[PDB]
Structures are given as C-alpha cells and as structure tokens.
Design a protein around this nucleic acid. Sequence first.
DNA 1: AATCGGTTGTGGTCAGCTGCTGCCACCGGTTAACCTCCATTCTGCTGCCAGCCT
Length: 54
Amino acid sequence: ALRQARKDAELTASADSVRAYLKQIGKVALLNAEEEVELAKRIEAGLYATQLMT
DNA sequence: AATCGGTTGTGGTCAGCTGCTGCCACCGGTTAACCTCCATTCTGCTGCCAGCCT
C-alpha cells in the first residue's frame, strides 16, 4: 500500500550527496523550550560529573 | 733625481644594527525577542523474466 510505497522510497540509492544529507537529517523531531532546558541541564550535570570524577 | 711600498691628517660616508617608538596588519573570540530539509555507432556488462527439470 502507501506503507510499502513509503518504505521502498525510504531505502533507495540517493546518489547525490546534498540530497542524501538532507534525507538523513530530516529524521529527527524538533524541540521545544522546556526540552532544550532539560538537555542543557543534562549537559552541564554530566560535564561537572566528569570533571569531579577525574 | 726617481720608485715601490708604509703612515696617516683629516674629512666625508655609508650602510648595519640597535633601540626605539610608534603603528599597523592579522588573527581569535563575541554578539541571547523570534523564524529549522537541494549525435551516431559499436561493444560489453548487468539485471529480468519465462521455461523445462527433479
């Protein structure tokens, strides 16, 4: 169906480098502000943790 | 008398650093409303699908 026609186009050659990169990066959802805040807090916590550990 | 080499009185001179004193290229870091996907011809190889065989 449209499912199989989606998947057969989903795995293809794509022998152009720009098109291959754009297809690759268009596979992750965007973020909102509280999610960005959560990620930044996780980054800072992990960075202080590895400094403290070494 | 000259003649092949020294001494040098003295006056520029001429560039070679030496500071030196700016000063001017050159390179790195920063900026915090918000807005997220570009002609023709010949030859050889590689993949397609029917068609007999166990």
